[PDB]
Amino acid sequence: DDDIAALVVDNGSGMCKAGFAGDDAPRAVFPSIVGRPRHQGVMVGMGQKDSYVGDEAQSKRGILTLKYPIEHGIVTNWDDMEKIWHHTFYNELRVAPEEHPVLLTEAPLNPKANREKMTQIMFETFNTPAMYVAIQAVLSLYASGRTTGIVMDSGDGVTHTVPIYEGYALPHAILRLDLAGRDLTDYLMKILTERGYSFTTTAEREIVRDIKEKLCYVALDFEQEMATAASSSSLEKSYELPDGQVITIGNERFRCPEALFQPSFLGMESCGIHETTFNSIMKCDVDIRKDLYANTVLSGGTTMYPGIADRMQKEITALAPSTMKIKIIAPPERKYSVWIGGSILASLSTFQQMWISKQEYDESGPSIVHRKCF
Amino acid sequence: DDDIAALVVDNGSGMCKAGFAGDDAPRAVFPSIVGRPRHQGVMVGMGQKDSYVGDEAQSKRGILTLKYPIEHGIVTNWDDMEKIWHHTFYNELRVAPEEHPVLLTEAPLNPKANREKMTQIMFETFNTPAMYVAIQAVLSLYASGRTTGIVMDSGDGVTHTVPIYEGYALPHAILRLDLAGRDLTDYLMKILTERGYSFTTTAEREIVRDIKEKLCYVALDFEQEMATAASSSSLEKSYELPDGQVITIGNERFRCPEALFQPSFLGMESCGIHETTFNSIMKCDVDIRKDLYANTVLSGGTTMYPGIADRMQKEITALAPSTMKIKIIAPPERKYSVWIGGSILASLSTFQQMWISKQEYDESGPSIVHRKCF
Amino acid sequence: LMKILTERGYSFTTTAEREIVRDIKEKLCYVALDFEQEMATAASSSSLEKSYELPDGQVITIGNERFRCPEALFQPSFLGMESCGIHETTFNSIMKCDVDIRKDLYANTVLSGGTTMYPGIADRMQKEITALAPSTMKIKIIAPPERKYSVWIGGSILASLSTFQQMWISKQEYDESGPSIVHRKCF
């Protein structure tokens, strides 16, 4: 045989997606949650499960506290990460981890101990023969199919922009805004308290997130949309809670994602995502801005609100000089783009030389990743 | 005697200094920021204040956004500059501006509209009897007390080196580099993310600037210092945040000032400050380079890091021929030296003939400053 | 308190007896500085027992239930809620603010409301917030004796100000703009 397939695991704050190198789609997609029972079990012989990992934790949300191992792109709890990776390797893919190389993705700017801890856990516990760490928005450009453009990745943890021209990345132009989907979920809860509906527990946060995913969109003109929603009730929708109660979302549908463009709603003084993209473009040199304007690529699940592409194009066109081409490239499957391009990175023949070997880790320790990746 | 002391106002990107002619030290020194509130006001009954200027803006930095009117030696928002000048004249010095002449400083190379606009503002809004515009690097040579020498001045927005021989300046050898303390502060904010500390807003920029002033120094040898820092944790310091948390920077103490000597860390193609000084010396005539090598003068608050003099002397001695001596003249009170030079300029008997009168301005418009000022 | 008074045998189920239970809670409850030591002390001896007289003349004894009922303020898991206590809520609200203003908020914590009048809330709150906060920051709990009416008293301060005469909602303004004017005029 030779050249065995190397598995790729994309971990974000929201979901974990794992799959083989050659496939165009991941095998397993499941949320990164670890739940533990609150109450005291009373039936003898029911069986004892200490912790719930993955989809069945979303099934049994009532009797558990939902917790997230990743917050803002940084792994806060590492035992939960070991649980997540074990459930990924042995239950979802059911493959031996010590016989395949592993590819992993991470945010651009993060604490430097995170890479070392991932490398140490991947080598010492799972005994993988090789592993590599890559930036998510670089892999998004591989999934795009072009070697020139600026990638704007918005996920559950962070939002980051990076420009790459002719295969060369400019490190000083990288910006990392902290707005993400979980902040939008919290803001949606806060504005849903205005109509009388109260969501406090961790299990109901998933319900609010589903409401956000199903009944939200980005208005093209926000203040016009406010006038239209105040004038009539045509911009109203109904949602059904799991217990049968019916709520009416009404006005709030375009108020939740509008906070992405004006962060002052959350009390943050940082600029919007469109201004972040424009500033990342403007930090580059004069000659490469023309190619960066015409190859802006959207990525991440958070960018699947309907109408975000037209709004982003309008704002960037307003900021940019009038005589240039501005076009926003939005793949219909962009939620998996960080995975998909990563799979392409595991298929190239020249990539076999830059795996981090076990012998190199033994010689240099966990710091070798800072020399080998990026 | 009928002699009225002329106000000397030194305006930089970072701080504004003000005093009288003939005094040893400036009476007023305060940061040049303008702050505005960013939150709701609910305590009805308190007074309303639209903007905060100077030390009061720093005292209440939590609930304000702070903006610098002067960026890279160029003022962008003229209304904030007018507010700063009004606060300087009425709340810091307690003098009537129409009684005294005012001497102002500016960078050597800049847009030509700045001189005309400050001339118009000082002659119309403040009704000063006379005014003059001088270049800061010449005032540093006045403060040194030597007629000939090369002056390098690095502040918060701009760095510039000029050569002067026997009171004659060479305009073609004047060099301007856009590297200063604000870029170093931004780089320190960027590289503090590696240890796990996140600083985003403007108050955090002020905190990082204070950290840089407290705990930064220049290494004589960069590779030796990097190896020493990697070998042991003896080269570490602890800082205390205003909320009580303690941070430990360690390796980042000597990496931030190194960007002054190697601008490739910031993505700039331009060479270092020592290279700029050597190139400015080499652009002069042959038989004045002997006098210019022995009279190198450092100025500005950016040149206040420990170890700058020794490192710059070693680098210039490496570049220069070995047959003759190079010494670096760094006075301990160099940060205010520019202002001191201005005071000497306001004390000379011949300089009473060099003022720009109000009648001359009325005849010649704002363009008289190009004719009557270097 | 009704649920844990059922545990000793006394039954309260009607709406009229809820007022009696409220009076019992107001008279014979306090906050323990250390919960585990107070439970151990109450289990060891009977010095903490108190007697209450019912409106019909019967006499009941509270005993252990004096400090268990207010403890649910600091441990909501007693009530089945998964939320954090009041000390953690205050600390989290402090941590959500900016870095520069946290010291003044630490030094100026003010208690209010009738619930904050159990004997020993101030000391327990100071101890818990001091445990959460860094050591260099010093905690300062402020609780006026007449805190139960403070929400009224500031109102009497608010209506007497000269600026507040321009801050009303006029009858003409309401007549022009419907009942929705209150969102614009009020915070």
Binding site: F222, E223, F261, Q262, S264, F265, H274, K314, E315, A318, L319, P332 | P37, R38, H39, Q40, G41, V42, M43, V44, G45, M46, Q48 | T163, Q166, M167, C186, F187
Partner: peptide, 19 residues
């Protein structure tokens, strides 16, 4: 299957500002 200007959340400590 003109940009929006920066907005500031309102103040209540003073009633109005006209001239």
């Amino acid at each position: 299957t003109t940009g929006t200007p920066r907005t500031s959340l309102p103040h209540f400590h003073h009633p109005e500002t006209t001239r």
